[PDB]
Scaffold this active site. Structure first.
Site, PDB file in Angstrom:
ATOM      1  CG  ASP A 296       7.088 -38.188 -24.935  1.00 32.04           C
ATOM      2  OD1 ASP A 296       7.221 -37.338 -24.035  1.00 32.04           O
ATOM      3  OD2 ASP A 296       6.637 -39.329 -24.730  1.00 32.04           O
TER       4      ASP A 296
ATOM      5  CB  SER B 121      10.538 -40.802 -31.866  1.00 29.52           C
ATOM      6  OG  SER B 121      10.375 -41.548 -30.676  1.00 29.52           O
ATOM      7  NE  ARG B 122      10.158 -34.146 -28.801  1.00 30.61           N
ATOM      8  CZ  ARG B 122       9.684 -33.063 -28.196  1.00 30.61           C
ATOM      9  NH1 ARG B 122      10.154 -32.698 -27.015  1.00 30.61           N
ATOM     10  NH2 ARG B 122       8.729 -32.349 -28.777  1.00 30.61           N
ATOM     11  CB  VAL B 123      13.144 -41.750 -25.808  1.00 31.96           C
ATOM     12  CG1 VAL B 123      14.029 -40.981 -24.855  1.00 31.96           C
ATOM     13  CG2 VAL B 123      11.695 -41.480 -25.423  1.00 31.96           C
ATOM     14  N   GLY B 124      13.494 -42.131 -29.486  1.00 33.39           N
ATOM     15  CA  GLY B 124      13.215 -43.111 -30.505  1.00 33.39           C
ATOM     16  C   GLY B 124      14.382 -44.044 -30.693  1.00 33.39           C
TER      17      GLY B 124
END
Ligand SMILES: Nc1ncnc2c1ncn2[C@@H]1O[C@H](COP(=O)(O)OP(=O)(O)OP(=O)(O)O)[C@@H](O)[C@H]1O
Ligand SMILES: CC(C)C[C@@H]1NC(=O)[C@H](C)N(C)C(=O)CNC(=O)/C(=C\c2ccccc2)N(C)C1=O
Ligand SMILES: Nc1ncnc2c1ncn2[C@@H]1O[C@H](COP(=O)(O)OP(=O)(O)O)[C@@H](O)[C@H]1O
Lengths: 479, 51, 501, 72, 245
Positions: C338, C363-366
């Protein structure tokens, strides 16, 4: 015991047929009884690299295969390559397979060890990250060495490689139970004999009573066949790890150098018909490196420390041989032609010597801050060499004159009169312990020894010897 | 004196940039050399395996 | 501890309760040994995947079964396999026995403990290659997984269910990041597993010592295969760690897996496929290396509500030589993972520990998993750190004596001063939000840059002992409340009065 | 030329004699050196000798190595 | 790939519908064949791939054409490996496309997102008979100035900007404004940067770039144009960042 015939040979690799069921396990020795040019019986040793099938195994020859016709008697020993270990190996020069080449006489002490032995288990291996204390001041302060660790060399010729080797040997063999197993793969014979007679005249090999010496020497010559310069490193390694395992010495190993070992591994594997890896090294580069390096550790018995030179192909650290050598190295000691041309030995470069041991919570906060401030002083002076030492001179600054003066003091103080530079250049030797190095450089920095001449610290041991040399030169000043 | 000081400063900047360009050119050159050596060895072993 | 009185009956307990079974087993004959392959002339109905056992103990796996021999692969140095000797097809296809008994015990690639403590009691069995969770067996991540680092947990957060590649050069601090993450989980139900491919034994021994002494062995497992070990054990051990983690993942428990490193698995698979004589691809790696990394890395996820809200967080590691990101293995893993955390060796060598590269890190889903409190306090930190990285470039000529650039130098050197950290000393989220907020407001601009770390640890300990409310508000509200802001300001002003006087 | 021996094997020769010739020069220099007499020898060039040996190897289906040079 | 292809092919053939297709990412579909051909025993082609590579490409791409019965528009990502553009799989992908938009690593690392390489992006539809004279003219001059800055970039990187003529720094400044105005915040990537998404028209993109190239906007700074939509967002950005002193 199984008598095998020679089926095929193509150069140094061999094809040994065998009786149907019984067959040597891989990495077993094979003595192929042969003949010389006049037909006197001579033997060529082999090592099984592959079990090809149909009652036939492949072997690579540690000796040259001129004297081995098809259909010769190949005797198996059943166990891997054995070399003698004990006091007989000390003081002598050995070949790949342990037949000594000092010509004083044959070996003794019928104990032995396989060249291929497992690494120490996960439970034995010591967690205490000690320091290899040395009589040298700079590799005590700037680039400390790990006990059991791996240290690299990069300095060329005329910078004092072999004197640094002999100095480590003398210091470890005087201060503690030091035993030095120098194993030189790819050792061209004239430089090897130069090394031998240097060890001879420098007092580290005693000739009137041999085996009381401090060194054991193995030679991987250039003209030796492919597997020979692979296996000389393992020869020296098992000869050293016997000293670790049974005498609990602090063993000092030397593989000069690891690049010839990697190259010979590639050439063995290229003759074996294996598909090569990326740049052209053997497909098994990392595992061959590991099975040589991770036998060099510190156990609860003792600790074998290796200092192994490296050659980097056209200074390219991106190549697989250096980038895989550094995966096991800890520190580096890059000797300089600059500190050889300036004329202060040892010729190492403090700004280019790295160590994983130089951290505060490993060797102390005091040692850490001392090394950091010394580095910063030398890093001031290196840029100030162009500034004031060439052109500027504009009463630089008193806060900068204070750095230039003590950077002179420290560049003089980094040297040390070696034990085995005495007969060479006229310098009586001194051991300088680690705490004395730290306190000496502490007082060179702290503004207590700025008034003495800058030569009062040049070629001196401790710091009290430096102040005493200042008083004696001042007596010559009042003369 | 002011223009000579400006000139010394501009040469300092140029030395910094030239050092860094030398670094990245060395990096890409190591990659180019390694890829070319690998390509040669792979085509050679492929042709040897073909015949 | 006497045992002679009980051994006289536990010698007899082994005899009682025994079935004396009969079983038709397959069995072949070993022909060729070399390059980690053994062609076996037997095994008529062998399964491609059998745990083929050898008469000299070594377990193997059947791959290349054409028509007149089965070319198995050896899990280990098949040295003493005597020619012609029998094999036994164990019936099971490449499984790992798993239980809770591993928690603490180190383990080989082949599930065999090397701790010298005991044996691992495991009745349940997990496949080493279990299928990765599909599109319905998943759920977008929102629970944070805090690594204890200010920079990571501040501006490049890590979810519970998000792969974060720790890419960086040799000796740049990636192991330090992974150990800090594992040690930060002393309370949270994150059953970490640390698999170490092809590393020096002294490094993993020192890390095992750290893990035991820091009170962390109660929830971790160390899968160890050194560089001494064969290519196949190193190639296999990440999948062993993945099976061990997926056991706890499917039973509703959050876990953490750290491969160290994937590049070593790539070298092991290159040696494996080159000694298998497979025409390799991009700079002699096998063409299958992307598959090699994906079929393990895409097993890390957040399991669904219907599946049980388990999670597997993968923190792989990829070493980069010469700093090139374009190289084959890192550009593959970035396309698989990711985000990345680059660890800049020039920062690290200048003295920035940890050397997190502030800009490349992704970070993609950060921001989903980053909590509300950290969000509200770390937005302004990100803005000021980005502008400092920009203002440091060409800082001398154009913007030398400005008010904004002098202030931003005292707030961009000092921001970096408060990012740095000692190895193996993590900060829980309360200390994180506090030490970020003081740099966000700017209550250290007048301080000397040398006394900053001492000032921060003093602020930390004062709010630790003398402020027992801030921890509770940050835990409860999960939002930087203005009441917490008030009481923390009280603490900051009194601690500043202690320090400047 | 009152003392110089010049062994020579040109390009039109097979790879065999190009590979051989430096060894004949070395045997002559070895003999004269073992007569207690100082000697010298010039190889020109080792690249042609290596190309001849590489061709002799690749014709014998010896496995090629780096830039087609065999592992010897 | 063939599964999605026939699942769109039925719609286009029978329902006559204009169909969209989004494939992500076909380099993996190439690497699949390159991984299975080494197991089928077939001889390896160029550096790692299968010999039947371009036929593998065509057997997808040629079936993705529009007819008189319907339409297939196929956006696809073509991952170039190891950041190499001349690798055989992107090299054989480049031929069966109507437009390429190559995504740089330098413009990504320098932050101008999207990281589209402007003058390495090409379409077969930039022709004055399709987009008219004005649009193609403005596009041509924009690419001209961008390449002028691209040619000067080495001389700039080694030494700087003062050594140039005024007529050269006019193009360097115009292209430094363009290279920032080529960014545009996304309706998706707002959750990353924080700048919410902006949709901008073509008829206003042309007018923004005409206002840039005329010189009615060159006075205001270069970071004003960064991460905006319409041209008035850039001018109001310049007016706004001179209020917060
Ligand atoms: N934040 C830190 N503070 C203090 N020391 C650090 C920090 N980070 C790393 N180090 C030190 O740097 C050294 C190398 O770090 P680390 O081992 O994490 O990198 P690595 O990539 O694992 O190196 P290698 O792969 O060669 O083992 C270690 O001795 C570690 O103690
Ligand atoms: C190695 C074990 C634990 C899992 C394997 N399967 C996989 O990982 C996936 C599902 N692959 C590659 C396959 O489906 C084929 N199996 C193998 O290649 C292999 C073996 C293999 C050998 C040498 C190189 C690559 C692969 N298996 C036997 C598997 O079952
Ligand atoms: N302490 C010292 N005092 C004086 N000279 C030294 C000292 N240490 C090293 N040298 C010089 O360094 C040289 C050693 O070079 P050497 O190590 O033989 O090069 P190589 O690496 O080619 O073997 C010696 O000739 C000696 O003059």
């Amino acid at each position: 015991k199984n008598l095998g015939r020679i089926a095929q040979i193509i150069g140094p690799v061999l094809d040994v047929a065998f009786p149907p069921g019984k067959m040597p396990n891989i990495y077993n020795a094979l003595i192929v009884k042969g003949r010389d040019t006049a037909g006197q019986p001579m033997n060529v040793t082999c090592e099984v690299q592959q079990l090809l099938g149909n009652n036939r195994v492949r072997a690579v020859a540690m000796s040259a295969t001129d004297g081995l016709t098809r259909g010769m008697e190949v005797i198996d020993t059943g166990a891997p390559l054995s070399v003698p270990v004990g006091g007989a190996t000390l003081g002598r020069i050995f070949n790949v397979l342990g037949e000594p080449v000092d010509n004083l006489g044959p070996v003794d002490t019928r104990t032995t060890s396989p060249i291929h032995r497992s690494a120490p288990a996960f439970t034995q291996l010591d967690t205490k990250l000690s320091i290899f204390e040395t009589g040298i001041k700079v590799v005590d302060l700037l680039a400390p060495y790990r006990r059991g660790g791996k240290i690299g060399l990069f300095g060329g010729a005329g910078v004092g490689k072999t004197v640094l080797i002999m100095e480590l040997i003398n210091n470890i063999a005087k201060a503690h139970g030091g035993v030095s197993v120098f194993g030189g793969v790819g050792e061209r014979t004239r430089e090897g004999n130069d090394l031998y007679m240097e060890m001879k005249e420098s007092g580290v090999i005693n000739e009137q009573n041999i085996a009381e010496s401090k060194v054991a020497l193995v030679y991987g010559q250039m003209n030796e066949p492919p597997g020979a310069r692979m296996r000389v490193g393992l020869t020296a390694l098992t000869m050293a790890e016997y000293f670790r395992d049974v005498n609990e010495q602090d063993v000092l190993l030397f593989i000069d150098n690891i690049f010839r070992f990697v190259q010979a591994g590639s050439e063995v594997s290229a003759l074996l018909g294996r598909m090569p890896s990326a740049v052209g090294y053997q497909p098994t580069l990392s595992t061959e490196m590991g099975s040589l390096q991770e036998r060099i550790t510190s156990t609860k018995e003792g600790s074998i420390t290796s200092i192994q030179a490296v050659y980097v192909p056209a200074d390219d650290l991106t190549d697989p041989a250096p980038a895989t050598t550094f995966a096991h190295l800890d520190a580096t000691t890059v000797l300089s032609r600059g500190l050889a041309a300036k004329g202060i030995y040892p010729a190492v470069d403090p700004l280019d010597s790295t160590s994983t041991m130089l951290q505060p919570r490993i060797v102390g906060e005091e040692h850490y801050e001392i090394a950091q401030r010394v580095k910063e002083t030398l890093q001031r002076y290196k840029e100030l060499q162009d500034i004031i030492a060439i052109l500027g001179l504009d009463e630089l600054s008193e806060e900068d004159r204070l750095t230039v003066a003590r950077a002179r003091k420290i560049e003089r103080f980094l040297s040390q009169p070696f034990f085995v530079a005495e007969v060479f250049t006229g310098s009586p030797g001194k051991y300088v312990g680690l705490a004395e190095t730290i306190r000496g450089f502490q007082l060179i920095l702290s503004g207590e020894l700025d008034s003495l001449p800058e030569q009062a610290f040049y070629l001196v041991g401790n710091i009290d010897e430096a102040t005493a040399k200042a008083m004696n030169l001042e007596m010559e000043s009042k003369l | 004196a002011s223009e000579l000081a400006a000139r010394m400063t501009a040469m300092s900047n140029a030395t910094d940039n030239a050092n860094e360009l030398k670094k990245t050119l060395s990096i890409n050159y190591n990659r180019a050399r390694q890829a070319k050596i690998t390509g040669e060895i792979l085509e050679i072993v492929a042709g040897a395996n073909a015949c | 501890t006497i045992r002679a009185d009980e051994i006289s009956k536990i010698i007899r307990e082994r005899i009682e309760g025994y079935n004396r079974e009969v079983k038709v087993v397959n069995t072949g004959t070993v022909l060729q040994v070399g390059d980690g392959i053994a062609r076996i002339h037997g095994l008529d109905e062998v399964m491609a995947g059998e745990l083929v056992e050898f008469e000299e103990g070594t377990i193997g796996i059947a791959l290349n079964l054409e028509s007149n021999n089965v070319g198995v692969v050896l899990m280990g140095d098949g040295l003493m396999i005597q020619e012609g000797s029998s094999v036994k097809a164990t019936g099971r296809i490449a499984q790992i026995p798993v239980s809770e008994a591993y928690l603490g015990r180190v383990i080989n690639a082949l599930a065999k403990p090397i701790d010298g403590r005991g044996e691992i009691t495991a009745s349940e069995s997990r496949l080493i290659e279990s299928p990765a969770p599909g599109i319905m067996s998943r759920r977008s991540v929102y629970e944070p997984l805090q690594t204890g680092l200010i920079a990571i947990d501040a501006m490049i957060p890590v979810g519970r269910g998000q792969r974060e590649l720790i890419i960086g050069d040799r000796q740049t601090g990636k192991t330090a990041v992974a150990t800090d993450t594992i040690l930060n989980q002393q309370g949270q139900n994150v059953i970490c597993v640390y698999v170490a491919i092809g590393q020096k034994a002294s490094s993993v021994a020192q890390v095992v010592t750290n893990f035991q002494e820091r009170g962390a062995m109660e929830y971790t497992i160390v899968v160890a295969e050194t560089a001494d070990s064969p290519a196949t054990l190193q190639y296999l051990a990440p999948y062993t760690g993945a099976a061990l983690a997926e056991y706890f993942m499917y039973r509703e428990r959050h876990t953490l897996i750290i491969y160290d490193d994937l590049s070593k698995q790539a070298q092991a698979y290159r040696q494996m496929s080159l000694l298998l004589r497979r025409p390799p691809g991009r700079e002699a790696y096998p063409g299958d290396v992307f598959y090699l990394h994906s079929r393990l890395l895409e097993r890390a996820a957040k399991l669904s509500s219907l599946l049980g809200e388990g999670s597997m967080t993968a923190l792989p590691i990829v070493e980069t030589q010469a700093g090139d990101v374009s190289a084959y293995i890192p550009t593959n893993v970035i396309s698989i993972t990711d985000g990345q955390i680059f660890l800049s060796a020039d920062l690290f060598n200048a003295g920035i520990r940890p050397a997190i590269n502030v800009g490349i890190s992704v970070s993609r889903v950060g921001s989903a998993a980053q909590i509300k409190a950290m969000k509200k306090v770390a937005g302004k930190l990100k803005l000021e750190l980005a502008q400092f990285a920009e203002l440091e470039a060409f800082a001398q000529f154009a913007s030398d004596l400005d008010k904004a650039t002098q202030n931003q130098l005292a707030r961009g050197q000092r921001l970096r001063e408060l990012l740095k950290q000692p190895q193996s000393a993590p900060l829980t989220v309360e200390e994180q939000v506090m030490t970020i907020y003081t740099g966000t407001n700017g209550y250290l601009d007048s301080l000397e840059l040398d006394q900053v770390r001492k000032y921060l640890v003093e602020l930390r300990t004062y709010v630790k002992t003398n402020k027992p409310e801030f921890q509770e508000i940050i835990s409860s509200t999960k939002t930087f409340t203005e009441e917490a802001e008030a009481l923390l300001k009280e603490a900051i002003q009194e601690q500043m009065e202690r320090f400047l006087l």
